[PDB]
Every structure is written in C-alpha cells, then in structure tokens.
Design a protein around this ligand. Structure first.
Ligand SMILES: [Cl-]
Ligand SMILES: [Zn+2]
Ligand SMILES: [Zn+2]
Ligand SMILES: [Zn+2]
Length: 118
DNA sequence: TGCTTCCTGCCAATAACG
DNA sequence: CGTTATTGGCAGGAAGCA
C-alpha cells in the first residue's frame, strides 16, 4: 500500500505507485483511490465518475448553479473560491487569504453536503 | 494568460464499534 | 451509546488547459 520515510524525525508516507509523499496517512489513502478505484464517486446528474468525494461535490454544485461565495465589499456572488478571489483582487485590489474577512461562504443548499456548524 | 480543475494539510462532522 | 476510526469540506496555491 505504501512505505514510510523518516527525515529529521518528520515522517513522510509514500504512495507505492506514483511515489508521491504525504504528511498525513489520511491524505495517502484518499489519494490512492486514483490508482485503484476501489470506491467510485458518480455524479448524481451525469456521466462523470470521480476518484475523490470532494471532486464530485464541486462538480455537482456546478450543475445546480448555486453561488456560495460572496464578496463583502459589493455583494456579488460566485460559484467557487477561485472566481471570488479573482474578482476581489482585481476589482477591490485586496487579498482574501490575507489579514481579513473579505468574503462569506454560504451554507450549501442546492444539494446536501456535510454541514459545518459555524 | 485567463480561466478551469486538481491537490493536500487540517480537522469537524459523521460513522462504525464494543 | 460513549468512544474510536473515517470521511470529505475547505483554503488557497499548483497545475492543466487552449
Ligand atoms: Cl444560489
Ligand atoms: Zn499515487
Ligand atoms: Zn455531472
Ligand atoms: Zn466585490
């Protein structure tokens, strides 16, 4: 399945197939489905099947059209982090990863994902 | 070069378990 | 049914297009 590598005390886990390295063992198994496809994640809405659960989920939010990421500076909503960040940097000349709260992530409602409590 | 999708550390939500 | 193991949502940078 894998093999460990230990440098300076820090432990790294290596995919036996593609030799990628992971700090987390959880990340390894998650990544490993790409090779082995033991679990499949089919889109509820079409063709595609994905080797990670979160890839499917992002794809499904695309079909529904829900816009969960909102700019606090002007109200515009976007489908994902990428579009939001892009808008905010170019229109407001600010970075959202930076010191402050520049956007709101609304709960998912156009389908049923895990619901964080904050 | 500007979307589009992928990637992984982190950990909360959820599930399995004795 | 507390308690341990698993899942996958999230950020935000990397990578993959044409
Ligand atoms: Cl919406
Ligand atoms: Zn691999
Ligand atoms: Zn689909
Ligand atoms: Zn704005």
């Amino acid at each position: 399945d894998h093999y460990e590598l230990i440098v300076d005390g820090r432990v790294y886990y290596i995919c036996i197939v593609c030799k990628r390295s992971y700090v987390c063992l959880t990340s390894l198994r998650r990544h490993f489905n790409i090779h082995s496809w033991e679990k499949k994640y089919p889109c509820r809405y079409c063709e595609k099947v994905f080797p990670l659960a979160e890839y499917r989920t992002k794809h499904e939010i695309h079909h529904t059209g829900e816009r969960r990421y909102q700019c606090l500076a002007c109200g515009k909503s976007f489908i994902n982090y990428q579009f939001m960040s892009s808008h905010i940097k170019s229109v407001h000349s600010q970075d959202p990863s930076g010191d402050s709260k520049l956007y709101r992530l609304h709960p998912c409602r156009s389908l049923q994902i895990r619901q964080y409590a904050y």
